[PDB]
Amino acid sequence: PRNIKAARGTTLRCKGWQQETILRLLENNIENGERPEDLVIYMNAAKAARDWDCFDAIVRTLKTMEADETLVVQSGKPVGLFRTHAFAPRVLLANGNVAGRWAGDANMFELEKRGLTILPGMTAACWQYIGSQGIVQGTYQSFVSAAEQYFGGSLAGRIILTAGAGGMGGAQPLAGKMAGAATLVVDVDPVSLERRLNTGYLDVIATSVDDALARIRTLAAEREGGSVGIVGNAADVFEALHRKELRPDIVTDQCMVDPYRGYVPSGLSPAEAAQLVRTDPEQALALAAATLARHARAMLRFRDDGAVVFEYGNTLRARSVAAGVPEAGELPSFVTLFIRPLFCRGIGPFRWIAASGDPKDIAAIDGIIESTFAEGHMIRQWIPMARKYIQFQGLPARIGWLGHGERSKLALLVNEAVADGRISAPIAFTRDHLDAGSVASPYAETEKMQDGSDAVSDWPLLNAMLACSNGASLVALHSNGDKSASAGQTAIADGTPMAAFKLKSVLDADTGIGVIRYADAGYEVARETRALHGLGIEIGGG
Amino acid sequence: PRNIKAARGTTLRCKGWQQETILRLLENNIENGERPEDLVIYMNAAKAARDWDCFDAIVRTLKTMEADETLVVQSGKPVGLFRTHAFAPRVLLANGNVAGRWAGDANMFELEKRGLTILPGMTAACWQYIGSQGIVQGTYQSFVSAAEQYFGGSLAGRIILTAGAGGMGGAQPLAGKMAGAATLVVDVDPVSLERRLNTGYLDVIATSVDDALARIRTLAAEREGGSVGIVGNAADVFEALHRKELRPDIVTDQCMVDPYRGYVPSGLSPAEAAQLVRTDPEQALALAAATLARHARAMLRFRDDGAVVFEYGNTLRARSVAAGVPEAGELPSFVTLFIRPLFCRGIGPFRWIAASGDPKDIAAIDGIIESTFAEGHMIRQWIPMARKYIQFQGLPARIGWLGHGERSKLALLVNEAVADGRISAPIAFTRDHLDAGSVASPYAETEKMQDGSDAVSDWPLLNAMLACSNGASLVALHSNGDKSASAGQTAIADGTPMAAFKLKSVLDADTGIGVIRYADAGYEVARETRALHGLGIEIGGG
Ligand SMILES: NC(=O)c1ccc[n+]([C@@H]2O[C@H](COP(=O)([O-])OP(=O)(O)OC[C@H]3O[C@@H](n4cnc5c(N)ncnc54)[C@H](O)[C@@H]3O)[C@@H](O)[C@H]2O)c1
Ligand SMILES: NC(=O)c1ccc[n+]([C@@H]2O[C@H](COP(=O)([O-])OP(=O)(O)OC[C@H]3O[C@@H](n4cnc5c(N)ncnc54)[C@H](O)[C@@H]3O)[C@@H](O)[C@H]2O)c1
């Protein structure tokens, strides 16, 4: 038992607070991981570092590096330390990037097996994970937008069905509950439900399908929001819930559907599945695809009854198409129905973390927001909700979606609050990679762009390079094999005037490049936002 | 006729010399382009900007931007201007990057057609092309290493056969001549040979195959180096040169073999080929692949006779394999035979350009080198050769391969020479993208890496991010569809102490990350270089 835990308090182990914050962020990733003794954070096998040896050497370099040197990380392995300057980043990471033609599913698996790459996830290998809370606002925003679009602004009395209680999926049953819906989440692995049940993200774990149906219908009939977990395989349980007439209003899914990493064929356990992939991969893929076709056909069968059925960024439709269900490619997605209007204004999963470990530092910022943004603002209705439902996990932190100009504004107020004692230690500002100007993903975030530019990955590359040029504390470029590319970045509010400058340079360009990206594709709200903030360039013949 | 030409002299059109140098570099790209009225620089269709409108807006932004702002370029289109700081780059470019699964040959063509991407080449869309001279030292180094490995250190009396007299290929007949060999270059387009003939890169253009054979044999019999061009299709001419018993010692090829961009089927002209691709692409590909199979089989037939036959980074083997010649995949390449030992020590196509336009500024640096590096050094034997054979093209410039620590050393001496009047204006230092630590290309530069890491593209991403963090003047990330990713960078020696700092920060990490990349793969010379310069990190369990 390594049992990594982020350091608490205000005593440096590093030569300076930039380094110590990143070290604590690294430790905090592991502390909140789904399988932390394997470095696994989430998405079945996305890791904080390539192995425990690289983890140890990363920790040593953080502790002794100077404020004008920069650590270089190649797929979870520290490979260099360069003398740079004080306004440059302290860490540069590039994880899981493989040239497209050889980044197919099968070869990524082989390269990872041989130790040549890691699967970075989004926030796993760049140390920006804050547990299940980093996901919950986005998923709650989706359920609320769905209630606004299709159910008259209310999920009271409505049924939400979904699967996946993993590191990201586990945020589902709380978001549904916060949204007013009776929410049923299927997971094949009881430990996953047990982890959400104990963390405050699941209300009860049902003992059977019948039991699950009675408890959801009671919530539905009382028109109360609540969460009900079921232990079972989504293929088998989805079909039984249709035979028993659950009649769900909303069906979605956040399973790991990767046959190589996490999708459990019907009849197997998670353990058996992972062993069949190590010893007989071709049978596993045959069994996985067999189970996914039933899984997808069951979701399509709920749609035929009138449920709103969408994908939630896990490649279910495409992988389902590959397994013989071409109708699965005609299902919609959470992005095109709910999130893209937010991205057009640069609104994304902005988050922050108290290196202190003191919950009073988060509550402090919570008061800043309520004194700083107008009532009715998206963020003024989220903070009371987060305060109410969301337990801290590891270093106290907060998810707070904000748009262009608003991120730099809050970050400067927090940097001043640090500078004058209301906050006891530095605040790390970061985000998910799935932000307006930092990801190209044709299966998810950039599906069906107005101008057809789905697969253009120039944008995240520019996002990273801007973050470096602006002085972010840590900058990362990831890939999901041949399907997606994205940029992440961390900027530290430590109280210094140097921090204040970086925070406003970094954050305004972070969202500014997102506004530009969507304006370029033709979205009119983004084009107006770009015109208003001077974000454009005059090009003739237009 | 736009007829772009780089500005000469020492009068600013921009607000500062960082901006004016980049503008002149942009203009210089076009001035030296193979088809400059279409923005085409080289590689059939790689362009300086997406269209003439973006070109004009890029020029306007350069002229009015401040020394603490940064211009952002997305596939040849200016998309943003951000307030950054004085130690950040002035331009960030990301050109031709498309997410892997959709960056296949056919879809890249469609995306370019619809105006959504550009093919950046290496130095075309990031404004680091210095004409055919940027290629000649590398190709001469290959011919000389081949003479050292297989022909006793001499090509006197030896025959070199090859094809492609394009922007890059045109460097071949001069490199062969400089190397002592009788060099025959086939190109299907007489204007290409005429351009090399007039620029000093081709000695004579033959009137027929017979004529070509007589003149090469005369050079061979006099054991003199010389260049002979032939107008014809490589498939037809290679076969005839075998029927007539040319018996070449060395066979290589630098054709554009892309059926979509530049490869001419046998019986067609360049014009007809490009029209058949616009109006009937499926017949063009059938005819191209038919011609390439004969082209490759003819090269293989020279090998069966005992010629040394290698590929030169144009994908001939892979595309030949796709067209039905699987033996073409067993041919070697210039990288694995000649260049990789240089890359292990960070030795790469370092180059520099006089924004002055005054040849006396290049000759000045030429004297610095001869006063600074030991006799017998690679660079002390190249400068007299370059002085002797290489005419200036556009802004006077110089190719000068140098290794780790040597690039920053020369760059600081030039920055001082600028600071004290021996050089009349700033010097722009750059390189090809095909450098040790800045490209992942499994078909070429990273084929058959000792550890199997051919397709790892983390490295160029890190190279770019380092250049930004270190304050390079311009930083670029390109892709060749799904086959390659690479980084470029420009750093300006303008005489300032700020320039001196950036030059040493940028160049040492530029090569330092290249040493690391090859040390990581296991190359012992690179591992020693890394140990010597403190470039590593201690990792346990090793
Ligand atoms: N913002 C977003 O776009 C977003 C949000 C949430 C989740 N996701 C996607 O969801 C996927 C998983 O993320 P994660 O971190 O939760 O992974 P995880 O590995 O932590 O959880 C995977 C879960 O699926 C479960 N499960 C697997 N196969 C099953 C099957 N046949 N039937 C029922 N349950 C099964 C596993 O037991 C496991 O608990 C990812 O692909 C992620 O990208 C995306
Ligand atoms: N350092 C390196 O690795 C290196 C060096 C030189 C060239 N190259 C490769 O060589 C390719 C071309 O580069 P370029 O800039 O010279 O392109 P280019 O478009 O300027 O020239 C292409 C040439 O091939 C000729 N040609 C085309 N088809 C032919 C055919 N069937 N028969 C005979 N001749 C034919 C065209 O007429 C044209 O002159 C590129 O793919 C480049 O990557 C690589």
Short mmCIF file of C-alpha atoms in Angstrom, two decimals, chain A residues 50-51 53-54 57 60-61 70-75 77-85 87-89 92-105 107 111 114 116-117 318 440-443 450-453 455-459 461-462 464-466 468-471 475-477 479 482-485 501 504-505 508-509 512-513 516 520 530 534-542, chain B residues 50-51 53-54 57 60-61 70-75 77-85 87-89 92-105 107 111 114 116-117 318 440-443 450-453 455-459 461-462 464-466 468-471 475-477 479 482-485 501 504-505 508-509 512-513 516 520 530 534-542:
data_model
loop_
_atom_site.label_atom_id
_atom_site.label_comp_id
_atom_site.label_asym_id
_atom_site.label_seq_id
_atom_site.Cartn_x
_atom_site.Cartn_y
_atom_site.Cartn_z
CA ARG A 50 3.63 5.79 -16.55
CA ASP A 51 4.66 3.72 -13.51
CA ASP A 53 9.20 4.73 -10.76
CA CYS A 54 8.38 7.71 -12.98
CA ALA A 57 11.24 10.74 -10.09
CA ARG A 60 11.87 14.33 -6.66
CA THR A 61 12.19 16.83 -9.52
CA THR A 70 10.69 23.63 -16.51
CA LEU A 71 10.04 19.90 -16.17
CA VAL A 72 9.19 17.95 -19.34
CA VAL A 73 6.92 14.91 -19.17
CA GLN A 74 6.53 12.46 -22.07
CA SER A 75 3.57 10.09 -21.58
CA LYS A 77 7.74 9.80 -17.72
CA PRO A 78 9.93 12.75 -16.67
CA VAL A 79 12.47 13.16 -19.47
CA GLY A 80 14.07 16.57 -18.97
CA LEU A 81 14.67 19.66 -16.87
CA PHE A 82 15.51 22.86 -18.72
CA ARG A 83 16.53 26.29 -17.51
CA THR A 84 13.79 28.52 -18.89
CA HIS A 85 12.54 31.67 -17.16
CA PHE A 87 7.25 33.59 -16.79
CA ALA A 88 7.46 30.21 -18.55
CA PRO A 89 5.50 27.17 -17.39
CA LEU A 92 5.12 20.69 -19.89
CA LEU A 93 3.40 17.34 -20.50
CA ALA A 94 2.62 15.48 -23.72
CA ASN A 95 0.81 12.20 -23.07
CA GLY A 96 -0.65 9.53 -25.32
CA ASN A 97 -0.01 11.25 -28.68
CA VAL A 98 0.67 8.76 -31.50
CA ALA A 99 0.80 9.56 -35.21
CA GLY A 100 -2.68 9.08 -36.61
CA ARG A 101 -2.23 6.16 -39.01
CA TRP A 102 -0.83 3.96 -36.20
CA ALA A 103 -3.03 5.22 -33.33
CA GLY A 104 -5.83 2.74 -34.04
CA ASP A 105 -7.46 0.89 -31.15
CA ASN A 107 -2.03 -0.67 -31.76
CA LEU A 111 2.05 0.39 -27.41
CA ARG A 114 4.99 -2.49 -24.20
CA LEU A 116 5.76 3.07 -24.87
CA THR A 117 2.70 5.25 -24.19
CA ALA A 318 -19.53 4.60 -33.16
CA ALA A 440 -11.08 18.37 -31.34
CA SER A 441 -13.34 15.31 -31.07
CA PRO A 442 -15.56 14.43 -34.05
CA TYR A 443 -17.35 11.68 -32.08
CA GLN A 450 -21.69 23.92 -38.94
CA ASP A 451 -18.80 24.26 -41.42
CA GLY A 452 -17.82 20.56 -41.41
CA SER A 453 -14.59 21.26 -39.50
CA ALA A 455 -11.72 16.88 -37.28
CA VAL A 456 -9.62 20.07 -37.38
CA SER A 457 -7.13 19.71 -34.53
CA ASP A 458 -5.22 22.95 -35.14
CA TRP A 459 -7.26 24.51 -32.35
CA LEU A 461 -2.49 22.82 -30.45
CA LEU A 462 -2.93 26.61 -30.54
CA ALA A 464 -1.54 24.78 -25.58
CA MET A 465 0.94 27.11 -27.30
CA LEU A 466 -0.98 30.14 -26.04
CA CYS A 468 2.84 28.39 -22.62
CA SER A 469 3.37 31.83 -24.18
CA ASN A 470 1.12 33.35 -21.50
CA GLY A 471 2.84 31.70 -18.53
CA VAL A 475 0.51 22.86 -19.87
CA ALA A 476 -0.47 19.49 -21.35
CA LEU A 477 -1.32 18.04 -24.77
CA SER A 479 -4.69 12.42 -27.52
CA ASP A 482 -6.67 8.60 -33.30
CA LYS A 483 -10.04 10.02 -32.20
CA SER A 484 -9.33 13.20 -30.23
CA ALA A 485 -6.70 15.78 -29.34
CA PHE A 501 -0.47 38.85 -14.77
CA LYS A 504 -5.34 37.24 -16.85
CA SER A 505 -3.09 36.50 -19.82
CA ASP A 508 -8.57 35.35 -21.42
CA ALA A 509 -6.76 33.57 -24.27
CA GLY A 512 -10.75 33.74 -26.25
CA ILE A 513 -9.41 31.02 -28.55
CA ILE A 516 -12.68 32.27 -32.07
CA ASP A 520 -14.79 30.50 -37.30
CA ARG A 530 -15.62 37.72 -30.94
CA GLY A 534 -11.82 42.51 -30.21
CA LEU A 535 -10.90 38.85 -30.68
CA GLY A 536 -10.87 38.89 -34.49
CA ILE A 537 -8.90 39.92 -37.57
CA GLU A 538 -10.24 41.70 -40.65
CA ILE A 539 -9.99 39.42 -43.70
CA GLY A 540 -11.00 40.77 -47.10
CA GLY A 541 -13.15 39.14 -49.75
CA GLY A 542 -15.48 38.24 -46.89
CA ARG B 50 -4.56 29.63 -47.08
CA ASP B 51 -5.35 32.19 -49.80
CA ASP B 53 -6.88 37.24 -48.63
CA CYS B 54 -5.37 35.62 -45.53
CA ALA B 57 -4.45 40.18 -43.51
CA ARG B 60 -1.43 43.94 -42.18
CA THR B 61 -1.26 42.41 -38.69
CA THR B 70 1.15 37.45 -30.51
CA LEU B 71 -0.49 36.57 -33.83
CA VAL B 72 -2.28 33.22 -34.10
CA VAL B 73 -2.44 31.38 -37.42
CA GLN B 74 -4.75 28.41 -38.03
CA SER B 75 -3.90 26.54 -41.26
CA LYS B 77 -5.51 31.98 -41.80
CA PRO B 78 -4.88 34.69 -39.18
CA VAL B 79 -7.50 34.12 -36.49
CA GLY B 80 -6.40 36.14 -33.47
CA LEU B 81 -4.16 38.75 -31.88
CA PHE B 82 -3.56 38.45 -28.15
CA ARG B 83 -1.75 40.69 -25.70
CA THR B 84 0.97 38.43 -24.34
CA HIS B 85 4.40 39.65 -23.23
CA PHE B 87 9.40 37.17 -23.97
CA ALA B 88 6.56 35.24 -25.64
CA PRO B 89 6.57 34.37 -29.34
CA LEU B 92 2.00 30.90 -33.27
CA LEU B 93 0.97 28.74 -36.23
CA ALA B 94 -0.84 25.40 -36.38
CA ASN B 95 -1.27 24.16 -39.95
CA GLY B 96 -2.71 21.01 -41.46
CA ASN B 97 -3.43 19.12 -38.22
CA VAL B 98 -6.49 16.85 -38.49
CA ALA B 99 -7.54 14.20 -35.96
CA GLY B 100 -5.92 10.94 -36.99
CA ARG B 101 -8.91 8.76 -37.89
CA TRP B 102 -10.12 11.34 -40.45
CA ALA B 103 -6.71 12.50 -41.76
CA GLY B 104 -6.50 9.79 -44.41
CA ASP B 105 -5.34 10.69 -47.91
CA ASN B 107 -10.33 13.14 -46.72
CA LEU B 111 -10.87 19.17 -46.48
CA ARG B 114 -13.42 22.84 -49.17
CA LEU B 116 -10.90 23.90 -44.23
CA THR B 117 -7.18 23.03 -44.06
CA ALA B 318 4.58 2.66 -48.69
CA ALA B 440 7.56 11.87 -35.64
CA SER B 441 7.44 10.12 -39.03
CA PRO B 442 7.32 6.31 -39.09
CA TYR B 443 7.69 6.21 -42.89
CA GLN B 450 15.40 0.75 -31.65
CA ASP B 451 12.61 0.61 -29.04
CA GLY B 452 9.72 0.46 -31.54
CA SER B 453 8.60 4.02 -30.70
CA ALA B 455 4.83 6.58 -34.09
CA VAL B 456 5.23 8.39 -30.75
CA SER B 457 4.36 12.02 -31.49
CA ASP B 458 4.71 13.34 -27.93
CA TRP B 459 8.16 14.60 -28.89
CA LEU B 461 4.53 18.58 -29.31
CA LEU B 462 7.07 19.00 -26.49
CA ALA B 464 6.92 23.32 -29.84
CA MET B 465 5.91 23.94 -26.21
CA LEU B 466 9.55 24.37 -25.23
CA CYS B 468 7.14 28.96 -26.81
CA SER B 469 8.23 28.76 -23.16
CA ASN B 470 11.75 29.80 -24.19
CA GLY B 471 10.70 32.80 -26.27
CA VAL B 475 6.54 28.60 -33.37
CA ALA B 476 4.64 26.19 -35.64
CA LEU B 477 3.05 22.74 -35.39
CA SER B 479 1.00 17.47 -39.69
CA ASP B 482 -2.13 11.03 -40.54
CA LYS B 483 1.52 10.16 -41.30
CA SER B 484 3.68 12.75 -39.53
CA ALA B 485 3.72 15.53 -36.96
CA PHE B 501 18.75 35.17 -23.87
CA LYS B 504 20.41 30.32 -25.97
CA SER B 505 17.24 29.22 -24.20
CA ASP B 508 19.78 24.47 -26.42
CA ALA B 509 16.35 22.98 -25.69
CA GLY B 512 18.49 19.09 -26.10
CA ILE B 513 15.04 17.57 -26.56
CA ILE B 516 16.71 13.13 -25.10
CA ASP B 520 15.12 7.45 -24.69
CA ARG B 530 22.47 13.34 -22.57
CA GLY B 534 22.95 17.13 -17.74
CA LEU B 535 19.93 16.59 -19.99
CA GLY B 536 18.46 13.65 -18.05
CA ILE B 537 16.50 12.65 -14.96
CA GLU B 538 17.31 9.81 -12.57
CA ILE B 539 14.60 7.13 -12.72
CA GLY B 540 14.81 4.16 -10.38
CA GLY B 541 14.31 0.50 -11.15
CA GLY B 542 16.52 1.15 -14.18
#
